[PDB]
Write a protein that binds this ligand. Structure first.
Ligand code: HEM
Ligand code: DAO
Length: 422
């Protein structure tokens, strides 16, 4: 079985030989060493091969331009069979089109992408803004509180329930299933190492999603107006009316949607407060010019970079960065490094809400796999900060945030926040 990752002090990157830099360490982000580790890789070995890691050997691509090329070159780099650095526990690999190459990727993505179509997102705006306001007003203003479960996880869990028309009181299952899936120690160095519970969740997921398919189909056959959820959309198109006869296209598509939006949205909502705390002149600039929120949302997403990387496999030998990536080698596109590449962003470690090229960030990736839910993610963040400006004159992080163990997700498990209303 995959042993748990136990945290040990990560030394300064300059004490290491270039060949010994291992950025798969799932504690790099928590210990605040990722910036120095990736900067040295960008400057001295932008295409870096690590032959010794707990996940096996892999290439690290750390420069913005080189990540662009790898992400856009689905002719040279495959997203199959997995896009995380390591491997899922054997038997637990789920086929998701995020880890599929064209043309099969295009067919499956096209059958689900309507759930985040612009018209369908506008139909969700009122509920998103209603829930955001209902969560923010319920927050205490006389004492600090943990922002992660109070706001980030709360709003995220509701959004995921809306996307699937999942039972509202069972929405916590979607978060729990997604957390254990994305936090598998064998895949991302996360803290979930019990493979038995992963098989249990996969069984509960199949049963619960199947029962949801039946219930929606029965409700549809009874004349219930079709909603804006993925299930309603899938049962309204001829090509996916029988998707239940394809359990893997069914479970994989539904599993990808909830894992895709779970801790990404959660950590984007928390990360904006961390950036505001580290650069408070941007909060004054925001209150003076609230029209900057759309661009600030992009800058929040760039600065946080909730998904640290996507992994590829070289379909062939590929020359890149002066190195020869061999066919079959694993290649890791470090978005978290690309978004801090000063070759692309001036003062890249600085949170600048009116940054002219904030929209050019690679937190959503690029190419055929570029985040399908990116507009929904930006919509939730825009509404959250619109509703924050309506209510609060200042937001203070009163404690050192606690960061999640993972090399894949960059997020916070604890964010103590003190609110000051206006
Ligand atoms: C700020 C929040 C988010 C970030 C940073 C993010 C990040 C990413 C990244 C890096 C990829 C892979 C890009 C690539 O390989 O080139 C991706 C793909 C994807 N994301 Fe997100 N995501 C976010 C929110 C969401 C949400 C809210 C949803 C759905 C509700 C979602 C659904 C998906 C799906 C379905 C894919 C697969 C698309 C494909 O492979 O064609 N994401 N996302
Ligand atoms: C965003 C990608 C989802 C994370 C995939 C990691 C491993 C695939 C899931 C296999 C089942 C499991 O880990 O419990």
């Amino acid at each position: 079985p995959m042993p748990e990752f136990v945290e040990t002090p990560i030394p300064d990157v300059n004490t290491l030989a270039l060949e010994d830099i291992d950025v798969s360490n799932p504690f790099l982000y928590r210990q605040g060493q990722w910036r120095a580790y990736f900067k040295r890789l960008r400057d001295e070995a932008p295409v870096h091969y690590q032959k010794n890691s707990p996940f096996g050997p892999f290439w690290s691509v750390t420069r913005f331009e080189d990540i662009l090329f790898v992400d856009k070159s689905h002719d040279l780099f495959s997203a199959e069979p997995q896009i995380i650095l390591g491997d899922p526990p054997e038997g637990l690999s789920v086929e998701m089109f995020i880890a599929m190459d064209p043309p099969k990727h295009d067919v499956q993505r096209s059958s689900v992408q309507g759930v985040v179509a612009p018209k369908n997102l506008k139909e969700m705006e009122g509920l998103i803004r209603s829930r955001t306001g209902d969560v923010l007003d319920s927050l205490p203003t006389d004492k600090p509180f943990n922002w992660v479960p109070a706001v980030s996880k709360e709003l995220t869990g509701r959004m995921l329930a809306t996307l699937l028309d999942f039972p509202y009181e069972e929405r916590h299952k979607l978060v729990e299933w997604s957390d254990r899936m994305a936090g598998a120690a064998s895949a991302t160095g996360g803290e979930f190492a019990d493979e038995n519970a992963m098989f249990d969740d996969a069984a509960d997921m199949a049963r619960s999603f199947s029962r949801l398919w039946r219930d929606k189909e029965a409700r549809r056959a009874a004349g219930e107006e079709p909603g804006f959820d993925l299930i309603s959309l899938l049962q309204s198109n001829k090509e996916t009316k029988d998707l239940i006869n394809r359990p893997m296209e069914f479970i994989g598509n539904l599993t990808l949607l909830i894992v895709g939006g779970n801790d990404t949205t959660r950590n984007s909502m928390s990360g904006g407060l961390v950036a505001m705390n580290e650069f408070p002149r941007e909060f004054e600039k925001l209150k003076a010019k609230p029209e900057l929120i759309p661009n600030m949302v992009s800058e929040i997403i760039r600065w946080q970079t909730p998904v640290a990387y996507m992994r590829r496999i070289a379909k062939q030998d590929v020359e890149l960065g002066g190195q020869t990536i061999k066919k079959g080698d694993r290649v890791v596109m470090w978005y978290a490094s690309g978004n801090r590449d000063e070759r692309k962003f001036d003062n890249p470690d600085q949170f600048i809400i009116d940054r002219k090229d904030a929209r050019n960030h690679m937190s959503f990736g690029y190419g055929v796999h570029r985040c399908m839910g990116n507009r929904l993610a930006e919509l939730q963040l825009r509404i959250l900060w619109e509703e924050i400006l309506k209510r609060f004159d200042n937001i203070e992080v009163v404690e050192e945030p606690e960061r999640v163990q993972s090399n894949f997700g960059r997020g916070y498990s604890r964010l103590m926040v003190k609110l000051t209303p206006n």
